Amino acid sequence: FVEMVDNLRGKSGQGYYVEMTVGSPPQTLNILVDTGSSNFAVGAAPHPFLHRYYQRQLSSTYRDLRKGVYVPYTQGKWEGELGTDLVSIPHGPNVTVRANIAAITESDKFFINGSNWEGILGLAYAEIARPDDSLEPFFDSLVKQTHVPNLFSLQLCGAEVLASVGGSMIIGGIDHSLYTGSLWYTPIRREWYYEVIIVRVEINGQDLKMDCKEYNYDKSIVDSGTTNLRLPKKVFEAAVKSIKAASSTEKFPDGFWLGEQLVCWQAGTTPWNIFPVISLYLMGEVTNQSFRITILPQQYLRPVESQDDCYKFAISQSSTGTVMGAVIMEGFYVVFDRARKRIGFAVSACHVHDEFRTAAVEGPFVTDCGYNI
Numbered sequence: 020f021v022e023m024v025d026n027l028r029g030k031s032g033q034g035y036y037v038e039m040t041v042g043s044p045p046q047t048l049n050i051l052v053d054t055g056s057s058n059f060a061v062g063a064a065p066h067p068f069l070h071r072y073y074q075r076q077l078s079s080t081y082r083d084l085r086k087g088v089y090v091p092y093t094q095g096k097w098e099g100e101l102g103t104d105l106v107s108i109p110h111g112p113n114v115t116v117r118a119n120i121a122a123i124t125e126s127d128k129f130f131i132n133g134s135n136w137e138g139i140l141g142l143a144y145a146e147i148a149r150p151d152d153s154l155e156p157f158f159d160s161l162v163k164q165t166h167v168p169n170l171f172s173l174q175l176c177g178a179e180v181l182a183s184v185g186g187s188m189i190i191g192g193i194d195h196s197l198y199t200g201s202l203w204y205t206p207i208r209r210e211w212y213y214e215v216i217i218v219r220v221e222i223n224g225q226d227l228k229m230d231c232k233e234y235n236y237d238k239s240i241v242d243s244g245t246t247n248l249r250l251p252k253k254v255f256e257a258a259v260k261s262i263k264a265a266s267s268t269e270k271f272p273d274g275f276w277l278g279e280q281l282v283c284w285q286a287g288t289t290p291w292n293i294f295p296v297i298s299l300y301l302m303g304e305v306t307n308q309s310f311r312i313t314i315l316p317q318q319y320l321r322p323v324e325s326q327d328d329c330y331k332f333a334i335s336q337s338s339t340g341t342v343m344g345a346v347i348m349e350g351f352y353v354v355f356d357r358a359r360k361r362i363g364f365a366v367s368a369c370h371v372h373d374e375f376r377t378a379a380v381e382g383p384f385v386t387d388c389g390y391n392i
């Protein structure tokens with residue numbers, strides 16, 4: 020898997036992208052790696068924030084599906100025209116796929132200024148594809164058309180201009196050089212999003228003591244296309260209360276806790292130790308078991324932007340369930356084992372750790388929590 024190592028790049032807070040080619044001759048595009056959606060969609064017309072876009076008429080292998088697609092999100096939306104074309108990942112498997120492509124012709128608040136990506140690779144399941152589940156997602160096509168095993172893994176690494184980030188998307192396998200210690204698996208509850216179950220949450224060793232249905236109200240997902248850890252209202256408020264208490268030695272503005280305002284310290288003086296660790300316990304493959312992933316402030320305080328180190332609080336409130344976003348995934352090696360309907364976590368080769376604490380994956384812990392039906 021050596022050629023796939025460090026095949027991801029991005030700007031802090033703006034997603035991780037992989038280089039892809041579309042069409043014949045190949046058109047090079049940077050594509051957001053998104054485990055939270057299921058469409059492959061690319062800019063296909065000029066936009067103020069696009070360096071370049073997919074030009075269908077320049078591809079000898081383009082086929083029009085003669086069907087429109089409209090995709091609204093909570094914030095932002097796009098519309099496009101469906102077709103198929105040949106797609107490759109130059110620093111991926113040595114294969115070429117005929118994939119569905121939504122050619123984006125109009126959009127609002129979708130593309131991001133400076134993100135350096137021109138489209139989105141939805142790696143989740145057909146159930147949440149638009150216009151409906153008959154539009155085969157990219158990974159499904161990849162597996163069907165080639166002999167690539169039905170599994171991929173993500174090693175997202177943490178970090179004027181926004182800090183550059185890097186990582187690896189290993190398609191078709193597990194690269195043992197990218198993690199240390201044991202890989203722990205949590206079941207994929209249903210194949211739509213990458214839905215999982217959280218059974219317990221601790222802040223600095225202290226149980227939040229909530230009925231575990233609260234942690235998965237109305238779902239919990241693993242989402243590389245969301246920056247933050249997003250928590251349901253009740254869980255969010257309890258989490259913030261606890262983090263405040265642990266770091267009470269210092270006082271921060273309200274807008275900070277709201278994930279809006281920055282907090283800055285003299286370069287290199289960031290008081291990491293006043294911020295507590297967060298442990299999320301994920302359901303194990305065995306019914307009464309769980310394992311925990313422990314995240315550090317170095318993950319949930321996200322760097323932004325001279326001689327000041329500034330951060331945003333990368334935990335925020337959700338009304339659509341828990342989202343384990345990029346700041347959670349960072350420093351873990353995360354295996355999306357579609358074949359065995361499970362997601363693996365291990366401590367990443369690029370995990371964060373200071374003198375006293377480290378990101379960890381530990382189990383088992385032994386003791387219903389699923390919410391949506």
Ligand SMILES: NC1=N[C@@]2(c3cccc(-c4cncnc4)c3)CCOC[C@H]2O1
Pocket residue numbers: 032033034035051053054055056092093129131242243244245246
């Ligand atoms: N997962 C996900 N993908 C979505 C999305 C769309 C556009 C940009 C980004 C993004 C921005 N900034 C950092 N990362 C990603 C994420 C679309 C599907 O659901 C809503 C969003 O959440």
